[PDB]
Design a protein around this ligand. Structure first.
Ligand SMILES: Nc1ncnc2c1ncn2[C@@H]1O[C@H](COP(=O)(O)OP(=O)(O)OC[C@H]2O[C@@H](O)[C@H](O)[C@@H]2O)[C@@H](O)[C@H]1O
Ligand SMILES: Nc1ncnc2c1ncn2[C@@H]1O[C@H](COP(=O)(O)OP(=O)(O)OC[C@H]2O[C@@H](O)[C@H](O)[C@@H]2O)[C@@H](O)[C@H]1O
Ligand SMILES: [Mg+2]
Ligand SMILES: [Mg+2]
Lengths: 154, 154
């Protein structure tokens, strides 16, 4: 594997004819309260718009998935809760090694008090808005919506 | 936006301090038959292993999402069916613009007869195997599993 670029959050490598983008692993937090899911939005230069996501971020040096999940939740929404590991997935294995660890957060409590918009919204509404072409989803946002519909109803 | 590299399936650009990887849009197909979901596996150099995915691929020039979905399904599994658009998501909006359009396939029929392994498996089994640390998920594979659990049971 030869490297053509070593950047901040990614390295561009070449493994034969395969173009490979190395990327730090990430975490995402699914949190439901009073029927609303905790989404977040921020301008994403890579896509030119603000998709609907759930609290997510990169795992920092010395951090394990659970600790990163806790930090991301607090820094982006000012909340903390009881976290449970759910599952993980490679965002796009065809070209990048970015792996995302998803957690569920319960018993949320505000521990703290601008570039990231906190968007509490019923998953049913996020889905319909998306179906209407009004809002876009990040993989984390869609996973949160589907997860809710499958195991958090009732 | 300045470009540091223009490759086969991706371009590495720089927009200010933001590192941006341009990538063609993709499609993914969710198909269920007799309680089993249609997964596929192939060695992915980017991650060094074969994660559980669902039929997916890049949209080619002149192709729209639906046509790409049809082509991918046939080329990877030799099947065709009635496709319905479900939703879309950006795989990792924090650095790439890759957008994936997900479809549901029904009334599958074999129209055709080696690098891609066709893996028919009950979503419940894929989830438990993953939870056991035996198999990894691509975002498409996880989305398929969650989608099934939320709307295809019974
Ligand atoms: N990192 C890569 N760099 C260059 N060429 C690649 C790479 N990965 C695959 N290819 C080439 O592209 C062809 C595959 O085309 P597709 O039809 O798009 O199918 P596939 O790549 O297997 O799945 C595509 C989509 O699913 C996700 O897992 C993946 O992230 C991608 O967005 C193959 O013949 C292969 O030679
Ligand atoms: N393309 C980029 N290139 C360089 N730096 C970036 C980029 N995108 C964001 N950053 C920097 O990284 C910091 C964000 O760190 P994180 O805690 O990781 O949170 P965030 O990037 O907002 O979400 C991370 C994860 O969610 C997905 O949407 C995204 O694909 C990523 O895997 C910000 O302060 C910002 O300056
Ligand atoms: Mg972070
Ligand atoms: Mg293709």
């Amino acid at each position: 594997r030869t490297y053509l670029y070593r950047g901040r959050i990614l390295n561009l490598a070449l493994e034969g004819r395969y173009e490979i983008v190395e990327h730090k692993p990430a975490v995402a937090v699914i949190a439901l309260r009073e029927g609303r899911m905790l989404f977040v939005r921020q301008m994403r230069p890579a896509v030119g718009l603000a998709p609907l996501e759930i609290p997510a971020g990169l795992i920092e040096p010395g951090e394990d998935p659970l600790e990163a999940a806790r930090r991301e939740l607090a820094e982006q929404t000012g909340l903390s809760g009881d976290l449970t590991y759910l599952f993980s997935y490679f965002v796009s294995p065809g070209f990048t090694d970015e792996k995302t660890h998803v957690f569920l957060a319960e018993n949320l409590k505000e521990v703290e008090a601008e570039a990231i918009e906190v968007v509490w919204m019923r998953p049913e509404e996020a889905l319909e808005r998306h179906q209407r072409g009004e809002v876009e989803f990040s993989a984390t946002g869609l996973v949160g919506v589907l997860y809710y519909h499958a195991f958090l109803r009732g």
